[PDB]
Each structure stands twice: as C-alpha cells, then as structure tokens.
Design a protein around this ligand. Structure first.
Ligand SMILES: *CCC(=O)N(c1cc(C(C)(C)C)on1)[C@@H](C(=O)NC(C)(C)C)c1cccnc1
Ligand SMILES: *CCC(=O)N(c1cc(C(C)(C)C)on1)[C@@H](C(=O)NC(C)(C)C)c1cccnc1
Lengths: 304, 304
C-alpha cells in the first residue's frame, strides 16, 4: 500500500550524462554510442539569444570548439551536425555504459522521469508529465539544458525529452532527441506564452483508481454518468475531453477495483462541482494528473 | 525556476541492490564490500510472523540456506550474523560497485531518497521524510523489504533507512543499517498504531521560502509574530514546535529572500487560520513538509 510520485531509477541515464562547453556556455549532453546530443543554443552567446541564425553561428564553430567532458576525461570530437534544435557531436569513443535505448516522441499527458544535471553531473531525479500545452512544470536552473526526460521498459531507455529553455511564465520547453520542440516553442529569448494548462482527465481517473486500491474511498458516490454528460463538466473545469480510448485504457483499473469507468467519472464530476471540502486523496488536496493509467498499474503491481 | 519533489540519482545505490531468498521468502538486500544487509524477517515463514523468536529461528539456518543473487550471478555466503533487526551475510566477493558510504541514523523531519526494489531489482525512486511519529508514507508492496532510504554528499551515500514492514494503517516502518527500528516498532504481525503524524514546521517554512524564490508570493502578508505566539497556533494545528535552532537553520533562506523567519511564521500562522481559499503554492493545495531547509538550498542552487 501507499502511493508516491515515483521516477524510474536514473542509474542507466547517469552513465550517459556529459558536460558540453562552447566558449563561455557550459550545459549537459547525452552520450549514446559515439554521439553526444545537446541543445544547439550551446553555440549562442547572450548577444545571440535574442535573434540567432543557428546555421550562420554554426559556420564559425569547428569540432575542436566543442569541449566534451565525461567525468574528468575529455572526449575527442571528430564531427558535428545540427538536426533541428539539437547538436550531434560524433566522438572517437563509444560510451561504454550505453544502455539499450530508443528516441520516442511522447503525446501530451504521457509521463516520464527527468534527471536534472549541471556541468554533465546529475543533481536530482523527479517524475514529470508533458502538459497538454506542450510545457512541463520541471525544476531547472541555468546550466540544466541537456537534462533529459526518459521512460524505461525493463532494460531499454526510451529518451522522450531534452530540456532547452524556461518561458517567462516559469514553465519549461524542450525537444525530443531528434531536436523537434514539443509545442510551438523556438530556442529564442522572445515573447512565448504557453496555452491553457488543461488537466489530464484520464490521468486523474487512474489516480482516483490508485486511491481506491490504497484504501482512500471517501470520494466514491452512488452516481454514474455518460462520456457526453461528464465532458460537459470537464469542459467547464478546463479538463481534457475523455474519449472511448481513455475508457479502454482504464479498463484494467476498472476490472481490478470492480468500479465502472463512468461511475468513477461521476465521482470526479462531483469533486469538480463540490471540491474536496478540506479533505485529501492519497495525501493531496488537489486532483493529481501526472500519473498515467500505466504508471498506476506499474506502481501497484511492482514492475522492475 | 520551478520546484519539484526531487530524489537523489539512484545509480550508486542500484549497484548495491541484490535478491536475498531464505526458503519461500524473497526480499531485497544491500551489498556493500563483502557484506549483504537485509531484514532479519527473511528467515520467517507466515506461521512465524505473529510471535517469532528470531534467535531460535536463526539457529535452524546455515550460510547455504541464504541464497544471494546479484543480477543473475549467485554470491557465496561464508558467514551470517544478526545485528538488532537486520541480517549481515558475509559473501566471498566485495561488491565491485561499492560507493563511498556511511550508516547514519536520521532525526524525524529529515528527508531521504528511497529506491523501491523487488527481487533485488530497482522499480522506482521517490523522495521521503522520516515522520515525527517515526513512520514514512512510502509506496511499498510485498517483496519491497530491504529497499533502502539514502542521502548523497557529492559521491558518499549515507544509508539512513531499510524498509521492514507496513502498519495496518497503511504507513511504513523500518530500521537504520545497524538494525535499530525508527520509533517503537517491532518486526512482528501485531497491533502497532502510529502516533500523531504532526507537520514538520521548519520544512513547511523552507518550502514557503522556496515558493517566494520561484515567484509564488500571494501568501506573504503585512504581519510578523514571535516563536511563543506562533507555537500556540502550531500546537492547535498539530505542527511541530519551532525552536531557535529551526530559525538559525532557515537563516540562509531568510537572507536570500530578505524575509525575516518570524515574518514567514506570521504568513504560515494566517494560512493555518484562513486556509488556502482554493489557491495553490508551488502547485500544491496543502502545505508541503517533506522539503528540509537543506533540500530547498540544494535544489535552488543546483548542487551536483
Ligand atoms: C540552460 C540554458 C539557460 O540557462 N537558459 C537559457 C535559454 C536560452 C535561450 C533558449 C534563449 C537560447 O538561453 N539561456 C534559461 C532560459 O530559458 N532563459 C530564458 C532567457 C528565459 C529563455 C533557463 C533557466 C532555467 C531553466 N532552464 C533554462
Ligand atoms: C516485505 C515483507 C512484506 O511483504 N510484509 C511483511 C512484513 C512482515 C512482518 C514484519 C510481520 C514479519 O511479514 N511480511 C508486508 C507487511 O508489512 N505486512 C504486515 C503483515 C502488515 C506486517 C509489507 C507490505 C507492503 C509493504 N511493505 C511490507
């Protein structure tokens, strides 16, 4: 029993974290095989950050201008290429600690673990969700760029996120490992506002299912509802519209608890309309939406 | 900017996790040098769990009855001893991945990272606090016993907690790595109730200081108070009495923010007396008390 905001063990990803310096700018890099992946804004001075022409800035740079440091040993850069918003620095040594890995682009609502790094050195690990406005509410300072978000399938590390920048609103924007930004964000110091940070409805229901499993059942009521009827209330409360796909994905949790998905929707509907009334579900005074149905099944069944 | 419930990177501790089997009972073990540390209740059958005489149960056991598995290789047990509530199995191989490590006994209110393990395989990592009633609100299933709580000082792992059992109340009890239980808990299946789970006042103030740093300042008011006056309100709200030591420890946060500790106490006093009024501080609808003053300074200054 007990339910916690769990991150994947970072060990496999710690072994891939390196320090990438270009001039006065130092940030984190991901070393998989004989390639080091980092944000392309490593080449930018504070002068450039406003309106940088990356292709033009990159012409000035050579292999020897990119200083890659793993632990306290220097890696020899033998080639550099720009793919979208990330730099790929080819080194002469394959990372001996390279795990089984994939580069996946996650959908909004999907969760991942973040290893926050500074000068290629991991500082902490926390669990995260790709917000429906393609932001993430991380904990990042300066020199955190290159810190990666990942999921582990037993021994295979699916790298989904690289951190690039913080918006003036205090939330975070980044790319997949192909350098394509999540949402409409560009690596520029410009007026960029996040959209509506809607609540991940399917994740809340999974977390309500998690609450029932762990014995927090006060919120369970005598009502059911319909997708259409629930979605009217969800719209009003800036919740994501719930689909038949979401219901199907919650099927396992529905089966294990013996609570129909639409009965749990009715309990959620009442919590939106009435609030908590000063009560807590799994030691939280608001409805947590950073646990996927998969996260709950994983944590509740003890997947290693 | 941004503030997250951060755990230490688990990599160093992942390399110390092994599977310890005694009969039908499998649980996690900590392999440091040529010693494997696990809960002594590994020797217990379900029959024993009610009223076990561990010394008498242990007479029946030999070195060869303890099956230690690191990854998918078997370790040879060449000696076993019972220290309090943990078993120390001496193996013929020193753990090649043994980090710099200490065995520290933490005080209630102190925070640590937990690597939740099953069959010696790490499943997830989450940050925790030793509750003032010497319980922890972890996420643990069956076979989680031997999962350890730790703090990292750069490259040195201070092991503070080993998980032993869940109380019928759904909270968790465990030992330091000398086998001494936190609080009055015994490794028995018996009527054991936790004391009052009081709020860690100093941790809340640190987290309020963290909120101000990250730009959540709505709760800052025009009032100050005194230790004695604040402590009257704290008592009423089942908060830990705040001492001069706590004020001194918050000094750095007080200096950086330019907010006197007793002015922040006055803001907390009002939040206790008035509630949140449906608002959130650092995306939380209740007052978080699982961040130490040290945790906030660490996360806000990016210590690696
Ligand atoms: C890791 C880089 C960094 O410190 N930042 C940053 C981003 C940029 C670009 C995208 C404008 C090139 O330059 N420096 C911070 C940041 O996002 N700052 C702006 C100016 C608000 C964009 C940053 C701070 C905290 C966390 N992550 C990044
Ligand atoms: C890891 C051992 C386990 O599954 N438990 C357990 C504890 C005990 C003793 C202390 C009675 C010997 O035997 N089995 C669970 C547990 O604490 N169960 C009781 C019966 C409620 C004590 C346990 C479950 C979930 C998380 N941790 C432990």
């Amino acid at each position: 029993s007990g339910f916690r905001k769990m991150a994947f063990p970072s060990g496999k990803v710690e072994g891939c974290m390196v320090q990438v310096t270009c001039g006065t700018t130092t940030l984190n890099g991901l070393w998989l095989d004989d390639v080091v992946y980092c944000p392309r804004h490593v080449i930018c001075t504070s002068e450039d950050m406003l309106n940088p022409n990356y292709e033009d800035l990159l012409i000035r740079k050579s292999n020897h201008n990119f200083l890659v440091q793993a632990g306290n040993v220097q890696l020899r850069v033998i080639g550099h290429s720009m793919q979208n918003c990330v730099l790929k620095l080819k080194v002469d040594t394959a990372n001996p600690k390279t795990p089984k890995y994939k580069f996946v682009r996650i959908q909004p609502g999907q969760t991942f673990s973040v290893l926050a790094c500074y000068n290629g050195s991991p500082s902490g690990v926390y669990q995260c969700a790709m917000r429906p406005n393609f932001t993430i509410k991380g904990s990042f300072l300066n020199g955190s760029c290159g810190s990666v978000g990942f999921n582990i399938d037993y021994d295979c590390v699916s790298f989904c996120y690289m951190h690039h920048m913080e918006l003036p609103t205090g939330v975070h924007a980044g790319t997949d490992l192909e350098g394509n930004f999540y949402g409409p964000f560009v690596d520029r110091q410009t007026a960029q506002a996040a959209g509506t940070d809607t609540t991940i409805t399917v994740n809340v229901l999974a977390w309500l299912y998690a609450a029932v499993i762990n014995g927090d059942r006060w919120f369970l009521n005598r009502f059911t509802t319909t997708l259409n009827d629930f979605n009217l209330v969800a719209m009003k409360y800036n919740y994501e519209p719930l689909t038949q796909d979401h219901v199907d994905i919650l099927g396992p949790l529905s089966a294990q608890t013996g609570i129909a998905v639409l009965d749990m929707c009715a309990s959620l509907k009442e919590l939106l309309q009435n609030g908590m009334n000063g009560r807590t579900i799994l030691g939280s005074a608001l409805l947590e939406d950073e646990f996927t149905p998969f996260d709950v099944v994983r944590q509740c069944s003890g997947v290693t």
